[PDB]
């Protein structure tokens, strides 16, 4: 009851959602440091300010020194992260790290050392009695009203199909993907850049994220959609500069999804999305596949495109047998499930033997987190 | 024609001990659903204390609690064939009937 | 009256049938288990579910750790065989085991270790009262309207050849092949496979047995059926995967089938069904078999195939004397004959004398079975 | 007398052996196209070069439109496989197709199109006056000083267990298992990228088969190997990149030819290789059951893991009866096996009254490979 209860840190590219478990919704939702000049400065339009916090020190990182991010979803940068955390805790939750067990989460197919690093800090850094990272996707699917099912969990830095019988996931057909949101914000502005356009300054970094998140759409026919840019009109639309100048994107728009698809628009051999749902449910019992196509879910900040649920029927009813009923699920709140997935799981008292503890941290060290977190 | 016996049968016999606690139900397809009187119902049967109830009013939280039930009645030997947290909180019939006549059978016979 | 009645269990391959003795039909006929992960699980598409039950546990059975099957028509799998009979009793009849005794059936030429193991769990598990244990074919039998013939009993696990004179089967003459349902389901997706097909996910192993029974034909000339397989048009027939694929068999229909006759088909020195017949036949009292060639009756789910009759009928008269008449007998219902033949029996209070009790089990223990069931 | 011998041309996933039937060895032995830009092409630092050939085509094969693989054992492209033989004719052997009859090899349990379409190239794009299609293990039988035996063949496509009795091959009781040398490699490739490894281009795909087949190993006992890995110290075993880097890989180098025996490690309900040769052993005649166990030959590229032999004892010896003498054979040549039993194979004047002739392919189209070999 509120002092104790685990908090669950759910930690977006864009976004980051934190609240205690047992709780409907994140009590603490942010956009995704504290920067001290290590050089005298101010600009004479500030006091002698030489500790910018939150975006005015973002867009000045480059000149300044950052003490505390997230891209492999995956965490390119860990003192900026380490901010992040800190901030939650002690400015948004208003809570003490080392009487409260943390469920943090973190990408599909997120790299072995990160995993580490983050059971290093949380426990030496912030000295947490107790913790465990949980797959976005997987939170996702406990928190919905199924069972059965497998879902398709595409944060910033993972992607995971995870086929799940009765609640369990099934972890010899579960299948990564490292590709997600991140790799979508950078494919845009190259292509964007390439158009001959300027995201020369640190902030408009981070305003291809929302051109990304504003225009974007998956076409259902990549190939009549190109034409259906040529024969323009009604494609292309228009994004502002803080700098008060003007973009335009038209083909682009979808091209940016594409590579969800066709990871070969990103130079990459991978299969796409479509692909991997199918070998997932291929590897799975012979007499529960019938339950993974009537139960395919999409979850993530990733999953958000216009025509995705379409586009993904679509694809999986070519490959799938000629008669399996498929059905997509594209709940549209595909805004909080993640979070919600993990304040149920923290909250049920299964989930105390589940942890790795203080001891155990100890005892192994920071691998111990690949043997417990599945 | 045994479902409908059987639901005013197991409903009575339900009835009839969660009286003593104070509670009834009235449609046993829908008042198992969220575990709490499933709870009652077997602690009241037992004599015994189950575990503390969730607070919430949630899937999960029904989840939760309709486990805390299915796990005292399979740590008293019996063998849930293929009756589920899921299938009780969705509040299906034969699931459910097939719980408490497994629970009649291991508490009263 | 009821409450004072044995309870008949039948326990097919592919169906169960129980219920009371001195009863007409089955109260209860349902497909031939408790599921719970055995590492914390859920599908998002299901709630934290962690026991599925039935076929949803079927089809994860590999991933799951189930609580109580049959295929020596023979019982494979002992804790799942566990978990039918409990629901027969506590969620089907609605019954106490402690209070009614038991008649369960079993195949033909079932294993020596079964019959005992099933001995053991019916008094040791559900602490019965009595029990006795009857070969399927001598129930079809008795429940018939004629008292001199013999049956030819197919059920899933085994087949007998069974002659019986005045209501008695002559012990001598019986004759246990083992071969039955369970080996044509498995022959079958051999030759699909081998086709390149692929049965590759639990639920669609369960997909054999129904285009087995669905499709699956006798020929009356495997030679000049064969040929009647490459002059196709007409032979080819297709099953629609769950998956929404197509499967085309042919030239297999009547193939699977025919290991009956032929069991060198299957990689077994065994006589076909044809042959034992007759060679029960010549094993008993040279002044009955006029008695039965005239009342061959087949009994048994894997006596249902289109062409058995014939064929049947076909193959005696061959090996016969040029003279016999031969009435081979197939009663449409030959679907519910097991069990009113068990409900008959046990319901007489001739059968009371009969049963294998609580006190002899402890007195002999398991072995018993084999001394008083025949 | 040489010209006018067959050419045996064996079709391996890392090698080919092709020579002339009557011969000791293969005369060409190469590892397993021309590739035009189809986009105006060349690097600068290479000629205007639009023809590249053999490897440096391999590595830029995407970016490039090649001319005629092997992976089911199984070919999966045609043109390139199509490359290789024209190769194989015209510029190893320098023969000519019209004039000599083929004897292809192909894997155990090759699937039916590809019989098929390599009988369609053969004969209408090669114009073969004649041609055959042995199964590689069954030819590496025939070259050994032994009659009577089971060989257990495992090349890149499949594996099958053959019983021989007195140089004849027994049908019923040959068993395919679709998984050999490829499915090795790409296990591999996916445990290794699964430590986030990256092998991201095309000539580097074909690096993991030479850590497969350089490092690889067979555990005699998995599980007491496996703690044998993290009693660490001498397993790791280091790979160096091309590219300068380093791999290293460690309990990966036993796991690998592991889902050889347990095909749950690749999401395959198949058997694996010891109780496949065990179960065709018991399909053959009672009387040389005791002849195939005292000759168990291994042969193909998949049978030449550190191992192998001891390992295929040690679990043939567990199924098998109590007292039966095992001797498994596993000749340190088991390099050129199938390409000998080939060459002996079409020099004998039997073997001429064996082939489908340019006549019977007209007469019947490609489906009569399935029909006259086997």
Same mark, same amino acid.
């Given at each position: 009851?509120?002092?104790?209860? *685990?908090?669950?840190?759910?930690?977006?590219?864009?976004?980051?959602? *934190?609240?205690?478990?047992?709780?409907?919704?994140?009590?603490? /939702?942010?956009?995704?440091?504290?920067?001290?000049?290590?050089?005298?400065? /101010?600009? /004479?339009?500030?006091?002698? $300010?030489?500790?910018?916090?939150?975006?005015?020190?973002?867009?000045?990182?480059?000149?300044?020194?950052?003490? +505390?991010?997230?891209?492999?979803?995956?965490?390119?940068?860990?003192?900026?992260?380490?901010?992040?955390?800190?901030?939650?805790?002690?400015?948004?939750?208003?809570?003490?790290?080392?009487?409260?067990?943390?469920?943090?989460? &973190?990408?599909?197919?997120?790299?072995?050392?990160?995993?580490?690093? #983050?059971?290093?800090?949380?426990?030496?850094?912030?000295?947490?009695?107790?913790?465990?990272?949980?797959?976005?996707?997987?939170?996702?699917?406990?928190?919905?009203?199924?069972?059965?099912?497998?879902?398709?969990?595409?944060?910033?830095?993972?992607?995971?199909?995870?086929?799940?019988?009765?609640?369990?996931?099934?972890?010899?057909?579960?299948?990564?993907?490292?590709?997600?949101?991140?790799?979508?914000?950078?494919?845009?502005? $190259?292509?964007?850049?390439?158009?001959?356009?300027?995201?020369?300054?640190?902030?408009?970094?981070?305003?291809?994220?929302?051109?990304?998140?504003?225009?974007? +759409?998956? *076409?259902?026919?990549?190939?009549?959609?190109?034409?259906?840019?040529?024969?323009?009109?009604?494609?292309?639309?228009?994004?502002?500069?803080?700098?008060?100048?003007?973009?335009?994107?038209?083909? &682009?728009?979808?091209?940016?999804? &594409?590579?969800?698809?066709?990871?070969?628009?990103?130079?990459?051999?991978?299969?796409?999305?479509?692909?991997?749902?199918?070998?997932?449910? #291929?590897?799975?019992?012979?007499?529960?596949?019938?339950?993974?196509?009537?139960?395919?879910?999409?979850?993530?900040?990733?999953?958000?495109?216009?025509?995705?649920?379409?586009?993904?029927?679509?694809?999986?009813?070519?490959?799938?047998?000629?008669?399996?009923?498929?059905?997509?699920?594209?709940?549209? &709140?595909?805004?909080?499930?993640?979070?919600?997935?993990?304040?149920?799981?923290?909250?049920?008292?299964?989930?105390?033997?589940?942890?790795?503890? $203080?001891?155990?941290?100890?005892?192994?060290?920071?691998?111990?987190?690949?043997?417990?977190?599945? | 024609?045994?479902?409908?016996?059987?639901?005013?049968?197991?409903?009575?016999?339900?009835?009839?001990?969660?009286?003593?606690?104070?509670?009834?139900?009235?449609?046993?397809?829908?008042?198992? !659903?969220?575990?709490?009187?499933?709870?009652?119902?077997?602690? =009241?049967?037992?004599?015994? !204390?189950?575990?503390?109830?969730?607070?919430?009013?949630?899937?999960?939280?029904?989840?939760?609690? =309709?486990?805390?039930?299915?796990?005292?009645?399979?740590?008293?030997? =019996?063998?849930? =064939?293929?009756?589920?947290?899921?299938?009780?909180?969705?509040?299906?019939?034969?699931?459910?009937?097939?719980?408490?006549?497994?629970?009649?059978?291991?508490?009263?016979?």
């Amino acid at each position: 009851d509120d002092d104790i209860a *685990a908090l669950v840190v759910d930690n977006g590219s864009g976004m980051c959602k *934190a609240g205690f478990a047992g709780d409907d919704a994140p009590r603490a /939702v942010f956009p995704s440091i504290v920067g001290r000049p290590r050089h005298q400065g /101010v600009m /004479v339009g500030m006091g002698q $300010k030489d500790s910018y916090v939150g975006d005015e020190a973002q867009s000045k990182r480059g000149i300044l020194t950052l003490k +505390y991010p997230i891209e492999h979803g995956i965490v390119t940068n860990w003192d900026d992260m380490e901010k992040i955390w800190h901030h939650t805790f002690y400015n948004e939750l208003r809570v003490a790290p080392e009487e409260h067990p943390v469920l943090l989460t &973190e990408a599909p197919l997120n790299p072995k050392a990160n995993r580490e690093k #983050m059971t290093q800090i949380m426990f030496e850094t912030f000295n947490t009695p107790a913790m465990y990272v949980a797959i976005q996707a997987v939170l996702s699917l406990y928190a919905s009203g199924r069972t059965t099912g497998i879902v398709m969990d595409s944060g910033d830095g993972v992607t995971h199909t995870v086929p799940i019988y009765e609640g369990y996931a099934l972890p010899h057909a579960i299948l990564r993907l490292d590709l997600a949101g991140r790799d979508l914000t950078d494919y845009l502005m $190259k292509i964007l850049t390439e158009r001959g356009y300027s995201f020369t300054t640190t902030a408009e970094r981070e305003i291809v994220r929302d051109i990304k998140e504003k225009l974007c +759409y998956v *076409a259902l026919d990549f190939e009549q959609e190109m034409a259906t840019a040529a024969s323009s009109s009604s494609l292309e639309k228009s994004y502002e500069l803080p700098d008060g100048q003007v973009i335009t994107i038209g083909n &682009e728009r979808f091209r940016c999804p &594409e590579a969800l698809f066709q990871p070969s628009f990103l130079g990459m051999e991978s299969c796409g999305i479509h692909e991997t749902t199918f070998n997932s449910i #291929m590897k799975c019992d012979v007499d529960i596949r019938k339950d993974l196509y009537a139960n395919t879910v999409l979850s993530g900040g990733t999953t958000m495109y216009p025509g995705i649920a379409d586009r993904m029927q679509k694809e999986i009813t070519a490959l799938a047998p000629s008669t399996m009923k498929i059905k997509i699920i594209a709940p549209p &709140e595909r805004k909080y499930s993640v979070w919600i997935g993990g304040s149920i799981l923290a909250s049920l008292s299964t989930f105390q033997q589940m942890w790795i503890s $203080k001891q155990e941290y100890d005892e192994s060290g920071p691998s111990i987190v690949h043997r417990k977190c599945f | 024609a045994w479902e409908k016996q059987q639901r005013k049968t197991f409903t009575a016999w339900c009835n009839s001990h969660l009286r003593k606690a104070g509670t009834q139900i009235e449609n046993i397809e829908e008042d198992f !659903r969220n575990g709490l009187k499933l709870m009652l119902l077997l602690e =009241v049967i037992s004599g015994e !204390r189950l575990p503390r109830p969730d607070k919430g009013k949630m899937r999960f939280h029904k989840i939760a609690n =309709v486990n805390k039930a299915l796990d005292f009645i399979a740590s008293k030997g =019996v063998k849930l =064939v293929s009756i589920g947290a899921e299938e009780i909180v969705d509040g299906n019939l034969k699931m459910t009937l097939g719980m408490i006549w497994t629970i009649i059978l291991r508490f009263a016979i």
